[model samples]
Target chain A: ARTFFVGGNFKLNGSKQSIKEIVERLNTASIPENVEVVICPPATYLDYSVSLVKKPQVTVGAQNAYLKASGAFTGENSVDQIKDVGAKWVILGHSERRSYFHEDDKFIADKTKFALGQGVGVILCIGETLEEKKAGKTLDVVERQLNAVLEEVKDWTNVVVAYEPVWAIGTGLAATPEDAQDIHASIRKFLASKLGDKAASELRILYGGSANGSNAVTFKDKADVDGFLVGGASLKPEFVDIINSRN
Target chain B: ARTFFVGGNFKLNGSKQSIKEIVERLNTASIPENVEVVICPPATYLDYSVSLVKKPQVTVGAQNAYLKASGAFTGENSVDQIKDVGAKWVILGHSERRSYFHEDDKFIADKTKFALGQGVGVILCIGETLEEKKAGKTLDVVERQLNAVLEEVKDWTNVVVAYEPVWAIGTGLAATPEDAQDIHASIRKFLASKLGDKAASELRILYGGSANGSNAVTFKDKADVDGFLVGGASLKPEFVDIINSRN
Candidate 1:
């Protein structure tokens, strides 16, 4: 069975006091036995959050990392450094990075491969912009993103797909459940073509565009909506609710 | 007096244990009364290193920061978050970011301005690539980088200029002491044209390429070589030597 995953991308927010509170609440919560929970604080708090986590179900991740093990790439984290501070996962190719920082598909794919090779799990994000969706290229855009990773990624076990339609994010206009299932199904079908139906069926695909505590439970019945890569709500009391929504 | 600034850009290197050791060494070193030393570890170690440093001369900095208070900019550190964890300075517009991450001049300048507005000191980096140097565009390239900041920055007190000719950054072939004096002197004159001679003379221009313990003292007498934005040697025991070289 594909394990349920809930990742909180704190995404350029949080102070020491606020993040400690988030971690404490998660630690005390009765997280589901079968679910996996990862909270990604700003890089400044990676080691801090790791030390506060008390539950085996919960772990820490970094929002981004560089391709190299170490070097003069100032301001960029390396996969090795992520693990050094106890972060087991990294969120890569998020739309914000793509639009704001100029990270392209091939670079994200190579970074995904690099992170996985170094034993760090990846919540690999892929999606089209609102314009791409308007242009009727959702699957084509998603597939093209996957093709870059497929070229280098030989194993699919440690990869979790985070589909964040750049337009739907922060707009509260997520694909209706029916629409989400259709897109996720199409994405799975595309992945199966490359990895075989057996392996693709086992991978988790998370919806990352503005999933929250109240809205999360609605996607429960989606065969392919295995979890969420949560954003703003991930910093609130509602984040615990999102993790518990999986139960 | 420029106060003889020395910044250690640990770059993408260092682990918890290694960084703690680096901090402990600086804490114990008898840094001169006039020298200002800042250790810039990766984001992962910012808080940890800050807590470890006990010297008045040694403070902590982050390698980079984004231009927001906090929001959906994934994989980026905000100046607010940097300061919340006790980092007083940030290194911006470094060569690595310009070359590898597609950070342009205006973008770096904006980020530097944002950080300054938020009460964070900035070690502003500006330099030419090997090709730009070979094509004899070195002064133009460096001037353009400075011009971007000059356009946005009105105050020079919290800003330090770090000139890293991209070709010499990691290579042992740094701009020789004679060449460094010429470039820094030229850089100062350029700033004097913008800020006027009196205020411009107070600015510190640091060389970021390959400045280590043994080589650091060699440039001690260079008039405009205000200090260094050190790389590899900053993590070693010799880093203390570089800091003390100001004496």
Candidate 2:
């Protein structure tokens, strides 16, 4: 049986009080046997979030991490610092990060490889903008983004590829399950060419961008669409629905 | 006597344990009556650091904060989040952010104003690079940087200006006290022209570069040089010396 992953990215939102309640809600929520749930709050709350999680299926990740172990890079969190707070995963190359912070493919790929090398897992985000999608370069864009990481990282065991269309993010426009499944299937085919058949089959790819409880369960039947990297809905109680979509 | 300030920037450094130890050390150390101390830790540990601080004079701050309260900005700590964790202070526009991360003066200024509006105090860092210093444009460079913030912010009450010369930072070439005082005095004059003499006189300017316990006490008598922004020394026991330099 393949494992379904549901990653809740709190992004720049949430206070200590709000997140404490969110974690508490998840601590007592109903979760299925085969789902892996990850919640990433802002970096300031990583230590506190890790301290409060009581569910075995629920773990915590950092929204971002720097490539360096530790040095003069001001305002950046090192993988060592993220791990020291008991977080096991770090999300890299989030579309918002790439768009707002000018993170290029190689830089995001480098940070991704570095995090994995430090024994921390990575939720690697790869997607195309509205213009790229409109121009029919969606596959080209996502493949280029993924190939950058594939060039540097040899193991995919510690990686979860999140396919989030930039145009849909925070815009209330989610890709239909068929369109998302087509992209995810093509992404797997692209990966199998470089990583062989078994590795590609074992990889868990998630659909993000405007994903909510209503649209999540619809993607469950799509073979290549294994889960979601939820955004705004993750902060609400509906996140549990996304987590239990496979049930 | 004006209250002297010492800020320790643990840039891209420290784990939960190391920072906990650093705060505990400050918790028991003998600090002067008039000196106020702030420690800016990596954002991941800001919450943990604040919870561990027991002393009245010692406070915790975030190394960096974003302008927006909450949004789709991935991997950024917002000013609202910084304040929610009991961190009243945020370090903005450090030379490392300018040199490495490409944070421009206007962008930093906008963030500064946003943070102050959110009721978070700002340790505003402005400095001239080695090239600007060599070209004798030190004052011009620093003033331009400060003026960008002045253009957006009206009140200077919650701001502390840190004048770090990039040429001296991490190069073991701190400007002599006479040289630092000269620039600090010049900076005050420049601020007075725009922010009024009363506000400029009240602005606390600190010199940061290879500043440590050994060099900190030397700048004590320099009237415009209010205190020190300790870097590497902040992680060590000698941080207490920098804190009590005016004692």
Candidate 3:
């Protein structure tokens, strides 16, 4: 069985006090033994969060990191510094970065390759937009996005794919468990075709985009829905329930 | 007279040992009381740098920040976080960000306005590429870049303009003192026309690009060249000499 994976992307939010509270909450919660949990705070709080994470199950991650080891790129975080701060994971190719920062697929791929090459794990986010889904181009968009990374990175040992439909993100409209399972299975099948059966079966694909405590349990029985890439819900107490939903 | 101000942008460089050493050097160096000094390390080191800075004469800054106070923008730092980390200044509109990240003039202006609104100081960078200069559009490019910021920001109290020629940046081709002064004077005159004589006359215009310790003193005598924005040299002990060039 693939290890269940869950990641919280704090994005551009959180203060020192709030982050302290979040890490403390996770520390106090009774988490499952087999689950792999990562909290991706903003780069500002990565070190602080890492310092606060008392549970071995809970690890800190950076919201984003640059492709290069270090030099001359302003406002961008280096994978080395992120690792130096004790963060082992980085979230890349999120729609928020795609829409706001204009980070194209190739750039995200390059960053993923470089980050993994530096021995950091990646929670690579891929998805289709409202327009593409409406036009029945969801699979095409997803394939194109995944193909970009596959072209650059052949190793899948340290990768976890998060399928975050852009239309559902922050919109409070989540994909039904069945719909998410369908797409995830399709993605897995596509992976099998490219990466071979063994690697594809071992890979974990997560369901994101408006996932919360209540609806998170609905995905528990779905075969391909490994876990979740949570957003706003991750900040509240409900996050604990979502993590324990496998119960 | 405008106070002589020098800022060192470490850019995408530095490790924990080196950053600690850089701050220790500043702590021991004899710096002038009248001159304002700020060093911008990468965002990963902001908190650590802020903690290591013992000298009240020196302060910390961030190389870039997003326009939002907080939100879902992944991989982007907010002005609030920069301030919370004890960074009082942010360097916006650097040629590196403009060229590599596609940060346009209007977007940079918006970021400057928001950062200042959040009570953070700004080192607003403006410059022309070699192509623009070759076509003799240097002054026009600088003016257009400045006008974008002026549209959003009416007050100049917390703003320091750094004129960094794209052709000279990292090329080790520092602008001759005479050429830099000509542009600084023109920028000042333009500011005077728009922001009134008092604000313009008291504004600090820094000469960036390839400034280093050896050549920093060359611009000391220039009327409008208020200080230097050292790049590669910021990582070395010689950064202290650049800070004391006005002495």
Candidate 4:
């Protein structure tokens, strides 16, 4: 049985006061028993989140990481430092980091290799842009990103694929169940073709966008959609319901 | 009366727990009211330091900033981002960054200009290496460094000149008061030659090589040695004394 996975990306939001209340709310909420849950807090809030999140199920993830361990690399957080600071997973290659922060495939691959080498779990996000999608090159672009990581880390067991199409993320344009299933199925098929049946079947491909309760059931019910990678809705009370969707 | 300015370049030392403690102490320490103080916490702790220090008298500084605001620059923080995060000061053209990080004088100069343009106060660090000092080229090398900033910044009022001898920093070998005074005096003349009498006299040139309480008095007593850019000792309890050195 595939365990349901839920991830919340708290991108560039939350001051000290707001973060405390958000964490407190999560702590008091009745988290879904059988679901594997994770939250990607901004890099600034990593230490305090680890200390406050009393639940073992809710792990903290860094939004980005550097390849080099410890050095003169200014303003970049090393993978080891993030690991040492109590972050278990690092979400690399997010659309914002790729588009806004100028992270390329090679850079993402380097970070993925280092984080995995340090034995940290990776929520490896792969997607194409609006232009790439419009040109019918979505799978092609996503393939290149996935292939780079595959070349570096052949074993995909330590990875969770978060397929967040650039246009859909943070935009109200939620992908229909059919739209998501097609992409997710294609991803699983590609994984199976490249890494054999055992690795492919075990892989969890998550749908990330403006994922919410309104669209959660439709998206989550699809065959390839293992879970929903919720964003803003994750902070709301509805996130608890989204986690327990499979029930 | 001109306010004294001091900065501590805490280059790559201290755990998160320890850094938090140090910042808290700095925030509450009874420092000289007339001094504008800041600590250049390591890149890993920049976000943490900014959040922890509540006192308006004390501000956090980035040890280095990228030449560009935002771009393909990896392992670097841009001037705008550094400034956007409420950091008031940044150290540019440090000899370690030049020698070890492969930062060129031209790039450092441009970075300083960009930083100052954004209204960020600059602790412009300059000095000579051991080879230059032995060859009696110390003054020439320092002149080039100071000239780089002086050429770019029309208004030198916001810049604090940190004379940090590359070989002496963190090496236990410190420039004697006489040696430091000689260079400091020369620096004053160079500033006067380039930026005219008014800007030269108004500028604060800080002595920043292994400065401790034992030698701080001698350094502070010198006309050109306005204050210090205390390093290792700045993380200690005695940092309070260095802040109060003006008294």
Deviation of model 2 at A230, angstroms? 0.2
lDDT of 1 by residue, A66-162 (tens): 8888887889988998898888999988988888887888999899998999999998999878889889998999989889999999898889999
- Residues A1-247 of candidate 2 have per-residue lDDT tens digits of 1699899999999987999889999999888866698998999888789989999998899899888989988899888988888899999999888878998999998899998989998999999898998899799999988999999998898899999999888789999999998998899999999978789999989899999888787877888888889989899998988887782
lDDT of 2 at B131: 86
Q: What's the ranking of the predictions by DockQ, best on top?
A: 2, 1, 3, 4
Candidate 1 per-residue C-alpha lDDT over B72-144 given as tens digits, one digit per residue, 9 for 90 to 100: 8889988898898999999998888887878999999899999999999899998887788779869999888
TM-score of 2: 0.98
**Of the pair 2 and 4, which is ahead by TM-score?**
2
Runs in model 1 with CA error above 4 Å?
none
Task: Kindly list the per-residue Cα lDDT of model 4 for residues A1-247, writing each as its tens digit.
Answer: 1778998877655444566777777788776667788877655566667778887678887766777775444345656666767788888888776765567898899889888889998888888778988899699888999998888888778888988887888788888789788998789998889978788889888888888867676655677889867777776768777776772
TM-score of chain A of 4: 0.94
- The CAPRI class of candidate 1 is high
lDDT over C-alpha atoms for residue B45 of model 4: 63
Worst 10 residues of 2 chain B by lDDT: B50-59
* Deviation (Å) of A78 in candidate 2: 1.6
**TM-scores of all candidate predictions against the true structure:** 0.96, 0.98, 0.98, 0.69
- Candidate 3 chain A weakest lDDT stretch, 10 residues: A1-10
lDDT of each model, Cα atoms only? 0.86, 0.88, 0.88, 0.76
